[PDB]
């Protein structure tokens, strides 16, 4: 659904939302569109191993340099491994093929580090009560620019964290929504089509222009 996201972003950006005579950004908020998952922490150890991350439900994952993934559910033992071609298997930290020993050790180190360091993005949002073993999205791909880290999840979401001012976007093409986390850590979800109708501030508009450039990079 990256193509859908590109359509949604092209459309809002073509509407020049920060040039509305009267910007009514608030009218575009829709709390029912709040994302279920986003990346709360991340660790770039890609010079040797991969990109470790935590989702907001406290699950962990690693996208290894060889394009395989381990997903540790928030029960601390249940595990999914995703091979390069996307083949999925289920196991536990406690019972795993010997061939996965090194990757599991790496997972444990990333998990330990993010258990002990760093803040959780979105910590103000209520922890979800739901099925903690329902299939988790995983990190499909990521990259960094000078300004941001771009994280693309398997549920179609794209998250962009800006390094300098700590602002963040979580874009969902299924809800056709963007969640903006601002410098004060206010977390608000907007329908993109309503940003077209009602406008938005220049800060959000600028970030949505950058977002489109990033989605283009993901599609390339």
């Amino acid at each position: 659904h990256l193509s859908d996201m590109l359509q949604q972003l092209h459309s809002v950006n073509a509407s020049k939302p920060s040039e509305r005579g009267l910007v009514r950004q608030e009218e575009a908020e829709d709390p029912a569109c709040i994302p279920i998952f986003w990346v709360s922490k991340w660790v770039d150890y890609s010079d040797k191993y991969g990109l470790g991350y935590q989702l907001c439900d406290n699950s962990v994952g690693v996208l290894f340099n060889d394009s395989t993934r381990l997903i540790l559910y928030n029960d601390g033992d249940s595990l999914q491994y995703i091979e390069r071609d996307g083949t999925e298997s289920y196991l536990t930290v406690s019972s795993h093929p010997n061939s996965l020993m090194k990757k599991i050790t790496l997972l444990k180190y990333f998990r330990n580090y993010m258990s002990e360091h760093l803040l959780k993005a979105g910590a103000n949002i209520t922890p979800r009560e739901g099925d903690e073993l329902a299939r988790l999205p995983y990190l499909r791909t990521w990259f960094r620019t000078r300004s941001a880290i771009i994280l693309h999840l398997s549920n179609g979401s794209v998250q962009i964290n800006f390094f300098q001012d700590h602002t963040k976007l979580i874009l969902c093409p299924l809800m056709a929504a963007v969640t903006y986390i601002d410098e004060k850590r206010d977390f608000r979800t907007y329908r993109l089509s309503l940003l077209e109708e009602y406008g938005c501030c220049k800060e959000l508009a600028s970030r949505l222009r950058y977002a489109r450039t990033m989605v283009d990079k993901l599609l390339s």
Binding site: K41, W42, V43, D44, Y45, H117, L118, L119, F163
Partner: peptide, 5 residues
């Protein structure tokens, strides 16, 4: 940055 905030 090599890690988040």
């Amino acid at each position: 940055p090599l890690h988040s905030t």
